[PDB]
C-alpha cells in the first residue's frame, strides 16, 4: 500500500540550564530509523533500524550537519517567538516540527506536508498545494510574511515532492525484507465478572502492523461508544501494536454483544462473540 517518511523535531528551552534540549526522529511508516539527541554523547545522527546502517560515512556526515542546523534554527526561533508572544525569558517553551512525504505502492508522490507548533499549539503550516502557508494567529502571520518574501515554499516543495520521495523510495528498497509488513491482528475476547450481576467483556487485538485499526461494540445492532472503554493503540516494543475495547454487560446477556475488528491484513471484518 501507501508509505510515508516523516521527520519529527522537538526543541525545549532550558532557561539558565544550557542550550535547549533538541530531539529529532525519522520514521518510515511506523518504523523509526534515525535519531538525534542533543544530550547524547555521540552528537551525531544515529541509526535505529537495520537497513539504514549500510549508509556510508558521507550520509551520516550530511545528516548530522543538517540536523544540527535545524537545532540551531530552532534556537533562534525560540527567542523570536518568545518576543512575538510577549513572554518572559524565565519560562520553558517548546517548538515542534513535522514534515515528510507519502508515496503510493507504485512509488508515485501522493502528498507532502510541513507543520510547526509552539507550546503544543498550531503555529504555521504548509498547505497541501505546497505553495501557500496557513498561520494560526496574528503572531505567526509575521513568520508567514517573512517566508512568503523569501520564497521558502519553493525550496521546501522541491524537497517534499522531489528529494523526500527519492530517499523514501531508496529506503523502501533497502529495507524491503525487514520493513514491517501488514501483520494481521490476533483477536480474542475475555470475560471478567465485576459483581454477581455484571461482567466486563474485553475485546483484544494483538501483534498487528500497521497501527491503524478499528474496534467497535454493538448490542443487538445498536452502538454503544458511550459505555465502551477504548484504550489508545499501544506499541508492543517489537514493532507491532496492541489495543483493546471493553463493555460492561448484565450477567446472562453476553450473547447480545458483538465486537468488530478492522485492519489492512484482514480480508473481511472479523466479528467476535463471547
Amino acid at each position: 500500500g501507501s508509505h510515508s517518511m516523516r521527520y519529527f523535531f522537538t526543541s525545549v528551552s532550558r532557561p539558565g540550564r544550557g542550550e535547549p534540549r533538541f530531539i529529532a526522529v525519522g520514521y518510515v511508516d511506523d518504523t523509526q530509523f534515525v535519531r538525534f539527541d542533543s544530550d547524547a554523547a555521540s552528537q551525531r545522527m544515529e541509526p535505529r533500524a537495520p537497513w539504514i546502517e549500510q549508509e556510508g560515512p558521507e550520509y551520516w556526515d550530511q545528516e548530522t550537519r543538517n540536523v544540527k542546523a535545524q537545532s540551531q534554527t530552532d534556537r533562534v526561533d525560540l527567542g523570536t517567538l518568545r518576543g512575538y508572544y510577549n513572554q518572559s525569558e524565565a519560562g520553558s517553551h517548546t517548538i515542534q516540527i513535522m514534515y515528510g512525504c507519502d508515496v503510493g505502492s507504485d512509488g508515485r508522490f501522493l502528498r507532502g506536508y510541513r507543520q510547526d507548533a509552539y507550546d503544543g499549539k498550531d503555529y504555521i503550516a504548509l498547505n497541501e498545494d505546497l505553495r501557500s502557508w496557513t498561520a494560526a494567529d496574528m503572531a505567526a502571520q509575521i513568520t508567514k510574511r517573512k517566508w512568503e518574501a523569501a520564497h521558502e515554499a519553493e525550496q521546501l516543495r522541491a524537497y517534499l515532492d522531489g528529494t523526500c520521495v527519492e530517499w523514501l523510495r531508496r529506503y523502501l528498497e533497502n529495507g524491503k525484507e525487514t520493513l514491517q509488513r501488514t501483520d494481521p491482528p490476533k483477536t480474542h475476547m475475555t470475560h471478567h465478572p465485576i459483581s454477581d450481576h455484571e461482567a466486563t467483556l474485553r475485546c483484544w487485538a494483538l501483534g498487528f502492523y500497521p497501527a491503524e485499526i478499528t474496534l467497535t461494540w454493538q448490542r443487538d445492532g445498536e452502538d454503544q461508544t458511550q459505555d465502551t472503554e477504548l484504550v489508545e493503540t499501544r506499541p508492543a516494543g517489537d514493532g507491532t501494536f496492541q489495543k483493546w475495547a471493553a463493555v460492561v454487560v448484565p450477567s446472562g446477556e453476553e450473547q447480545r454483544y458483538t465486537c468488530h475488528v478492522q485492519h489492512e491484513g484482514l480480508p473481511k471484518p472479523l466479528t467476535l462473540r463471547w
Binding site: 535545524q70 517567538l81 521546501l156
Partner: peptide, 9 residues
C-alpha cells in the same frame, strides 16, 4: 534524508 534548508521564523 533530512531537508537541508532553513529559514528562521
Amino acid at each position: 534524508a533530512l531537508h537541508g534548508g532553513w529559514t528562521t521564523k
